[PDB]
C-alpha cells in the first residue's frame, strides 16, 4: 500500500461533524470537529493535511464529498489526486471513553486521536511510529 | 538538539491571531488561525500537536502564555513539559506572497505552511522531510 494514500470521511456526534483522515498504510489519524459538512471545510482540511504529510491521493466513502469546485481547487493547488477500517468505530469508542474528561467534543476528539496514534499495536509499534517509519523509508 | 522540542508562539495579522509551532531540530511548522489568544485555544492546539508528533518539551517567547490551569492541564494530560528563528518572519513573508490567492487569512496561512514545509533548503531536504527523518532515526 502506497505511503501517499489517505482516506477522508465525516462522522456525526452530538449534532456536530468530525472529519477523520486515516493514513491507510499505517492507521495514523488526524481529525477535526467542523461546524458543517461544507466544500470549504473539506478544502481547508485538505490544505492543512497536505502541508504536513506528503499527500498524493485521497479516497473517501462518499464521493460526492469531493465534487465542489472549492475542494477540487484545494487538490489542484496541493497537487492531490482522487480515487474513483472502519478505524472510525474504534475512534468513536475512544471518544466515548474520554468524553467526560472535557467540556467540548472537539477536545475529546483530539484526546481520542492522541490515544489512537500512541497505542502500541500488535500484542509492535504505534500508528504514530509507523507513519513516520513508512514515510522516512520512502524518502531515502 | 533533541527531537522532542517544539517552540510555540502567537503572531497578529489582519486583527487575527496565528499560533505557530516550530519543530526546533528541523524547522518544520504547524500553524492555525485562532479567534483569540486564550488558554483554551493554546491548550487545544497543544493536544492536537501532541497527538501527531512525540512532543516532549515546549518553549515559547512569551512565558505568560503557559500559566493558565487550562494550559497546564493539557501539558499534564499529554505528558508535555515546559522550559524556563525567527522562522516567523519568513512565514509572514510567504503569507503576504499568497495572500491574494484566498479570501480567508486562515487559508492563506495553511498555503504558507505548505510552502514552507515543502521548500528544498540548502542550495538538501525540506523541513517536512527532515522532521520525518529525525523522528524515525530517533525511534529505531
Ligand atoms: C481545552 O478545552 C477544554 C475542554 O474542552 O474541556 C478545557 C476547557 C474549555 N476549559 C478548561 C478550564 C479549566 C481547566 Br483546569 C481545563 C479546561 C479544559 C481542559 C480539559 C481537558 C484537558 Cl486535557 C485540558 C484542558
Ligand atoms: C477554503 O477557503 C478558500 C479561501 O479562503 O479563499 C476558498 C473559499 C472560501 N471559497 C472558494 C470558493 C470557490 C473556489 Br473555486 C475556491 C474557494 C476557496 C479556495 C481558495 C484557495 C484554494 Cl487553494 C482552494 C479553495
Amino acid at each position: 500500500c502506497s505511503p501517499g494514500i489517505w482516506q477522508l470521511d465525516c462522522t456525526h456526534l452530538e449534532g456536530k461533524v468530525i472529519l477523520v483522515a486515516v493514513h491507510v498504510a499505517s492507521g495514523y489519524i488526524e481529525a477535526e470537529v467542523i461546524p458543517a459538512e461544507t466544500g470549504q471545510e473539506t478544502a481547508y482540511f485538505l490544505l492543512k493535511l497536505a502541508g504536513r504529510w506528503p499527500v498524493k491521493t485521497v479516497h473517501t466513502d462518499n464521493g460526492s464529498n469531493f465534487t465542489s469546485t472549492t475542494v477540487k481547487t484545494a487538490c489542484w493547488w496541493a497537487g492531490i489526486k482522487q480515487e474513483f477500517e472502519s478505524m472510525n468505530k474504534e475512534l468513536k469508542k475512544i471518544i466515548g471513553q474520554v468524553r467526560d474528561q472535557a467540556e467540548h467534543l472537539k477536545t475529546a476528539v483530539q484526546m481520542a486521536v492522541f490515544i489512537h496514534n500512541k497505542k502500541r499495536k500488535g500484542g509492535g509499534y504505534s500508528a504514530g511510529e509507523r507513519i513516520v517509519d513508512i514515510i522516512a523509508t520512502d524518502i531515502q
Side-chain angles (χ1 to χ4, degrees), chain A residues 65-84:
Chain A
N65 273 343
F66 293 162
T67 59
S68 83
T69 52
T70 310
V71 172
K72 299 161 154 192
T73 305
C75 293
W76 164 80
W77 190 94
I80 296 154
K81 307 189 296 179
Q82 200 187 349
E83 266 148 316
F84 275 99

Side-chain angles (χ1 to χ4, degrees), chain A residues 5-120 122-137:
Chain A
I5 313 171
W6 291 77
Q7 171 124 354
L8 185 169
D9 295 291
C10 287
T11 31
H12 275 57
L13 216 57
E14 310 188 0
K16 286 156 145 59
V17 176
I18 305 170
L19 170 16
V20 178
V22 179
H23 183 249
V24 176
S26 66
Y28 169 91
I29 288 172
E30 310 219 343
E32 201 84 56
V33 168
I34 68 178
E37 208 154 323
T38 77
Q40 181 186 147
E41 293 302 324
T42 301
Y44 180 74
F45 184 91
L46 282 163
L47 291 175
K48 199 135 138 236
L49 187 71
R52 171 165 318 126
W53 303 105
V55 179
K56 296 298 159 271
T57 62
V58 181
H59 187 58
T60 185
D61 283 354
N62 186 163
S64 67
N65 273 343
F66 293 162
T67 59
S68 83
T69 52
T70 310
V71 172
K72 299 161 154 192
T73 305
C75 293
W76 164 80
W77 190 94
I80 296 154
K81 307 189 296 179
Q82 200 187 349
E83 266 148 316
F84 275 99
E85 281 289 53
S86 284
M87 233 143 207
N88 280 62
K89 322 307 193 178
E90 138 81 359
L91 215 215
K92 213 103 95 159
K93 204 202 335 196
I94 305 162
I95 288 165
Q97 287 162 355
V98 302
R99 188 57 189 88
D100 63 54
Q101 259 148 291
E103 195 187 339
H104 301 133
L105 169 68
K106 68 196 280 59
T107 307
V109 164
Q110 301 309 327
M111 289 165 106
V113 172
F114 181 105
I115 287 158
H116 176 262
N117 287 338
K118 308 301 204 211
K119 214 259 301 308
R120 322 59 49 169
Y125 296 91
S126 68
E129 295 167 327
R130 288 184 313 259
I131 185 175
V132 161
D133 190 74
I134 285 156
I135 286 127
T137 303

